[PDB]
Predict the 3D structure of the following.
Amino acid sequence: ANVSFSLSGADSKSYSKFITALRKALPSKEKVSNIPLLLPSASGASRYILMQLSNYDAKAITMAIDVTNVYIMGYLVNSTSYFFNESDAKLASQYVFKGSTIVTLPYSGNYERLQNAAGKVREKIPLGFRAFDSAITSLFHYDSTAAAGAFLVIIQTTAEASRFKYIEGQIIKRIPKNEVPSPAALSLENEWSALSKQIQLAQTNNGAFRTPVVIIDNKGQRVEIKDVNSKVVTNNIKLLLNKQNIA
Ligand SMILES: *[C@@H]1O[C@H](CO)[C@@H](O)[C@H](O)[C@H]1NC(C)=O
Ligand SMILES: *[C@@H]1O[C@H](CO)[C@@H](O)[C@H](O)[C@H]1NC(C)=O
Ligand SMILES: *[C@@H]1O[C@H](CO)[C@@H](O)[C@H](O)[C@H]1NC(C)=O
């Protein structure tokens, strides 16, 4: 695997080192406003990196991540791989976990689909170390009725934390006790592509966003980000979705 993390003996520093390693494992040819810009495209196997995760009992699964968007495609346990039911995952299955028995999951990997499958919205799914441990166990034995919920936990704990310092911070605060994420965290998840797009457009607009991005803050209030001097841009977002993959 290109990156790996083990919950056994982990603390806030080992988690942060892992997230930092995930961010550096993603290819990038340039930075925009000091933030690494993801590749507009990649071909073959080079389009994916592998992330190995082990729970407290040392049971491990390996997940494949699409480097152009940090989306999880599927995962491998024993000699069976499971991929989301969507075209990008179907393509990924042609290049990773070669030789494994490929199982197609009954849902795609976007949040709306996963929430419906799990029967619960992100606002009510606890995150933290024990939740992470529990999610890995569910996928390790492929408990089909818990998989969607397990993906919701893992995606936010890895992919979303790699995209935003604030979300990385949310997991750290939840190490001693699981707790649902804040509305602010979910707001950043939903606006990642919009923020990525505006930061790139701002480059030929003297730092100002063409269209303000609206999120909600830690106090539950509506806040507008309209320029690259915002704290969200200088000290929060850590990866940018390439504009060619937005609109
Ligand atoms: C990820 O690991 C694979 C397998 O060793 C390697 O071929 C590939 O170059 C790595 N990708 C990156 C960008 O680290
Ligand atoms: C995947 O989704 C398609 C519709 O987009 C459906 O026809 C197919 O049966 C699904 N496969 C699985 C594994 O559920
Ligand atoms: C993988 O093998 C382990 C050890 O036999 C087993 O506990 C686990 O359920 C298997 N996972 C799947 C999804 O088959």
The beta strands are 3-6, 28-32, 35-38, 48-54, 60-66, 71-77, 80-83, 101-104, 208-216, 222-227. Helices lie at 12-25, 87-92, 111-118, 129-140, 147-163, 165-173, 183-201, 231-234. The chain has two domains: 1-162, 163-247.
